[PDB]
Subunit: 255 residues, 4 copies
């Protein structure tokens, strides 16, 4: 198959829910080996039980801790023999205006969304440099391109993700390590449902409709639709792409 | 399959050589029906004879002529029953500085690269509106994003392509017609080899070496590597993408 | 005065109304010499009679005619001794969807908005090369960056303007000819008020209220606010800027 | 005057050297009151002695400390009566590849370049909300737009700056607080000269010659040329601009 993901090993941060879990399913469906690095044990174990797949491994990981990042990379190499693709998908959203935001909250957002991406990438790159090739895919956002209202720390973190992506692409291209990002729009995931309710008036269904209408396609994205972009970026279909940002936003950033 | 291109009808302008023909091969490999609309009849007919594939059809087309564009769309509908995807790949490059460029040459570049894209899209859209869905993929360029040196009319036409892409995406999203573009870097095709030789001192091989070095990946792209982006954009893998520009440039625009 | 525009010669296309005329007033206020190239002779002569300013000259010009473009540039040089700044401001808007747009209408939009900018720039550049320096400022649009709904040919033209700007900047930097563009949002001019009324149901005041709300600043721009960006781009203040796009859109493109 | 900066109070972080100090001079020249917040007390005191201007005040400030940021804002309000403009110019560069970079160094870059910008903005915004208006100008970089080689943490931080700029613009536009950034290219400052020598073979003069050649204008920028963009952004000339990035890079990002 043209995508050529079979028997590749893919390490996905934040893989036990949402887009990350859709990515786990998509990569397992391509017969790739998947290592999930995520912070919640019960949630990781529930994923493993449901998938019931010898190509899947869960490693509890706090990506803000460098030792834990190193351990996650090692777990992939030990469990499956190597590491072909790192997907830095973990991220959090805290809603607060700049003039009110607690420094501790600012730091939490940047630490998970940006520092953790740095630390994971650092340890993956040490392996990929030695292996002579690799692929890093970062989950950016529409918020790395334009500003979503009311989430300035999140948007700032995602601008950091965008430029970290381009930077690693430029610095590592000579080493055959491709680095790209996906920039999702508004995706229908349980974490987003929670944020929808917390931050808007209305029932869940009313708010989903409101959020759908800001996109030209007039619907929210599904997590599988972002997973499918990650398949493409990991695959050989994207072999001449590095330093690219791929919007998957139902047209949001085209207007 | 996950790409879901089997039995889809794909009309490719400029399909009889270069990136266009690589796209023909990629789509035929997915069991799509392919209609090639291109200007050199002998070349098209030779492609058909060589391929010997009943899913391929050639229709001689000058895309600067509206009646010919309408006829190409009709040919797809008559030959294969419908039209699912239009790939506006035809384009030309004329090298001249602004201060010396002939108006006739300026017009030629804009007519093929931009007006012809409009005219093909116009007639494909009439059909796709009635079909209730569709997909348009435009060949843009790195030159639609940054300026390549010494080809200002080309760059201008490709900025037009970029914005035509976004505009059709915004205006037709509610009709389930996705519209995206690919932005290739420097691709090794026989046609580009001609431009290399005409615009630089040295042997062909010397000049190719020089062109390779300007990209982080340190090589020229292959036409199949652009075809594969087109496959993704046509496929269901990209279902939440519209109004997107996908760069495939070895990192060129990341620096 | 730090902007230092006194005795600079500025040629403004489309200068006899709207943003163009606000620019005329702004530049005359800075004691620059201003040559207006615009299509309506009566309108231009009325402007000259009203302004009663020896620093102002009007030359009737159809910018789609190359001889007229050459004559406009020559008239600036002959009248005031040189040509320091060309402002390519002329543009038109035709409202039509791609699937219905007449080829003749498509061509009109591209001819005025893009080809006329090429032709004016060609002839200005011949002069500026000989002078050893120059400055070209192009009126782009938010529509060169994202798609405004329902005006696809306009947006395409302005993507062309954006890339033509970058291209001339790259190609002529070594000749000390700086080339930049302004990307206005929705600007309150009598011409736009006519378009508002022609293309929407409601009173002028209702339509303006609706158009204001789409921008973070919650208001339309005044023409003088775009003229003031042009003052900056023409001035010495922008001496290290070339190939850049300055958005003046009340925040529209930041979301 | 048209810029209307007389008696406006401007707080400039990193104001005691380089671009920051050129901005100090430019704003003092417009009869604005200037408060410099910078980390080196001796350097600040030497600046004050040299400028010898009652419109200048220095307050030693570590912008990574929230209390110090608050104290800097308070010093502006207490010394001159209010705060009209915040210029977040402070930044540092550490050169290291991702795969080798120390977390402590990553954190230093992000803390100064991005967290400090957040904390200064937070406390400035509290004042500006109460005042009913304001202006924030952030020093971004070409590195916020594309990747400069070998400084990935720096580029990441500047992508953060870009998006923080857009976010505050979107969130505070309704409060009449404009927020924009400048994206400088390679600027000739004593601090950059030290980096040039540290990170390249050759004499200073040789290295400056090499750095100049990567820009279409074929020279490095002067710090005053960035200060002049800041004047424009603070001034009423930019009244319809918010959420904008102004590149001042000699054409670097146009290619």
């Amino acid at each position: 198959m043209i995508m050529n993901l079979t028997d590749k090993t893919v390490l996905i941060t934040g893989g036990a829910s949402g887009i990350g879990y859709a990515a786990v399913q998509a990569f397992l469906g391509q017969q790739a080996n998947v290592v999930v690095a995520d912070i919640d044990e019960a949630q990781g174990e529930a994923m493993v039980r449901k998938e019931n797949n010898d190509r899947l491994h869960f490693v509890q990981t706090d990506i803000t801790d460098e030792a834990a990042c190193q351990h996650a990379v090692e777990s992939a190499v030990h469990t499956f023999g190597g590491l072909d693709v790192l997907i830095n998908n973990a991220g959090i959203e805290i809603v607060a205006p700049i003039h009110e935001m607690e420094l501790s909250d600012w730091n939490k957002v940047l630490q998970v969304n940006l520092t953790g991406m740095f630390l994971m990438s650092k340890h993956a790159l040490k392996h990929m440099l030695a292996a002579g090739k690799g692929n890093i895919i970062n989950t950016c956002s529409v918020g790395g391109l334009v500003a979503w209202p009311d989430i300035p720390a999140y948007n700032a973190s995602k601008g950091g993700v965008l430029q970290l992506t381009k930077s690693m692409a430029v610095d590592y291209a000579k080493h055959q390590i491709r680095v790209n990002c996906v920039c999702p729009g508004i995706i229908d995931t349980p974490l987003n449902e929670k944020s929808f309710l917390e931050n808007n008036e209305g029932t869940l269904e009313e708010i989903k409709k409101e959020k759908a209408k800001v996109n030209p396609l007039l619907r929210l994205g599904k997590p599988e639709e972002i997973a499918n972009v990650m398949l493409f970026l990991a695959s050989d279909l994207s072999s001449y792409m590095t330093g690219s940002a791929i919007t998957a936003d139902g047209g949001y950033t085209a207007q």
